[PDB]
């Protein structure tokens, strides 16, 4: 888990991969979805494949190169 790269897919439809390492996973991940994306609240529903990711699941992949992407969940665009 040196170089990884997953692809975060927001607003259902908001790809924007962030470049993690093992260390970073969903979390560090969901660590930019607020700062990189801007999804700080609770709109930071993580989802791959249909499932609700963990803050492990960069390190525990690692077959996320590119092809690989976490959709994301976030009802507030603009809050309010």
């Given at each position: 888990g040196y170089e990884c790269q997953l692809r975060l897919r927001l607003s259902t439809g908001k790809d924007l991969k962030l470049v993690v390492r093992s260390?970073?996973?969903?979390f560090h991940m969901k660590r930019r979805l607020h700062?990189?994306?801007?999804?700080?609240?609770?709109?930071?529903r993580w989802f791959f494949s249909g499932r609700p990711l963990t803050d492990k699941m960069k390190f525990e992949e690692?077959?996320?190169?590119?092809?690989y992407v976490v959709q994301v969940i976030v009802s507030q665009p603009v809050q309010n």
């Open positions: 260390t970073d996973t969903v700062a990189a994306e801007g999804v700080e609240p609770g709109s930071q690692l077959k996320i190169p590119k092809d």
